[PDB]
């Protein structure tokens, strides 16, 4: 039932830029149960932050989580050119795994 | 080496059934957690099922009852097998414990 | 006194008829505090 | 220009984002020296 509320839906920034992806969940979600998904146009599922502060194996530090209960935070310091992708959040906390709705990152 | 491989895709009359296939490379399907995601067309991504390594196995309340998800060792193969399929049910599903995705039309 | 980290006091008031020494007589002084203070003290003064 | 203050201040409205909020912070931060313990808890009896 844990619905995640990604805003925005859509974001256009420049490169350089620092693009915060804001993610809030309906219930305070239990020791930052936050998973952040990177999903290239017509390409698979890639993760970025476990547990909302643990990176992924691989992904660049310019990727940061952040939040706490029902707010996360999904921080990319210095924009890429490759990271104009869609990035979805998934909560965990709950039987009923659920993810958020996506947020768009524009040129 | 490590290598998920998902088959079983296709288009679907409504109400039929299916069953997935998840190659494995490199892992070890029942000592490693098991899960399949689903992605509907510009949708986000929904976890349905999930299977434990040691046998437990749990399944998404809106596939509850229709779906049913198991692995042959003997293969080292993850299976997702869908039962009373619909409309809602076209996604994307691509195996994790991922893989590549696979499209399914119903 | 003071001893495994406990300062401990025993007191007493007792009335007295003299003027001038100790008298002659017994008692005792049963506790009246007890202080963790785990602090090691080798001096003191007395404060009129 | 090349000379910053370290210091700077928390903006605090209520309209600010859920994890941009103030959020009222006790650091609980226990010792257990040599020293004899001192702040214990308040055990219930029964009837006698």
């Known amino acids: 039932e844990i619905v995640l509320t990604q805003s925005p839906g859509t974001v256009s920034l420049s490169p350089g830029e620092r693009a915060t992806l804001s993610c809030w969940a309906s219930?305070?979600?239990?020791?930052?149960?936050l998973a952040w998904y990177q999903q290239k146009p017509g390409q698979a599922p890639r993760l970025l932050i476990y547990?909302?502060?643990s990176r992924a194996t691989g992904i660049p530090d310019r990727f940061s989580g952040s939040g706490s209960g029902t707010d996360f935070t999904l921080t990319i310091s210095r924009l890429e050119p490759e990271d104009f992708a869609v990035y979805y959040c998934?909560?965990?906390?709950?039987?009923?795994?659920?993810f958020g709705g996506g947020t768009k990152v524009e040129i | 080496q490590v290598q998920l491989q998902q088959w079983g895709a296709g288009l679907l009359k409504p109400s039929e059934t299916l069953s997935l296939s998840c190659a494995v490379y490199?892992?070890?399907?029942?000592?490693?957690?098991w899960s399949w995601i689903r992605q509907p067309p510009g949708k986000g991504l929904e976890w349905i099922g999930e299977?434990?390594?040691?046998?437990?196995?749990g399944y998404n309340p809106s596939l509850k009852s229709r779906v049913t998800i198991s692995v042959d060792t003997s293969k080292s193969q993850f299976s997702v097998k869908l039962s009373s399929v619909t409309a809602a049910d076209t996604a994307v599903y691509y195996c994790?414990?991922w893989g590549q995705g696979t499209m399914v039309t119903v | 006194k003071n001893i495994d980290g406990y300062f401990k006091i025993y007191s007493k008031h007792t009335p007295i008829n003299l003027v001038r020494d100790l008298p002659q007589g017994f008692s005792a002084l049963e506790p009246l505090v007890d202080l963790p203070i785990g602090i090691n003290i080798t001096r003191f003064q007395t404060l009129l | 220009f090349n000379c910053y203050f370290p210091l700077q201040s928390y903006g605090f409205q209520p309209t600010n984002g859920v994890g941009y909020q103030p959020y009222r912070v006790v650091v609980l931060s226990f010792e257990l020296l040599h020293a004899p313990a001192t702040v214990c808890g308040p055990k219930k009896s029964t009837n006698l």
């Open positions: 994790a414990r």
């Open positions: 490199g892992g070890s399907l029942s000592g490693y957690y």
């Open positions: 299977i434990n390594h040691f046998g437990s196995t």
């Open positions: 219930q305070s979600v239990s020791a930052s149960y």
């Open positions: 547990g909302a502060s």
């Open positions: 998934q909560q965990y906390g709950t039987t009923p795994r659920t």
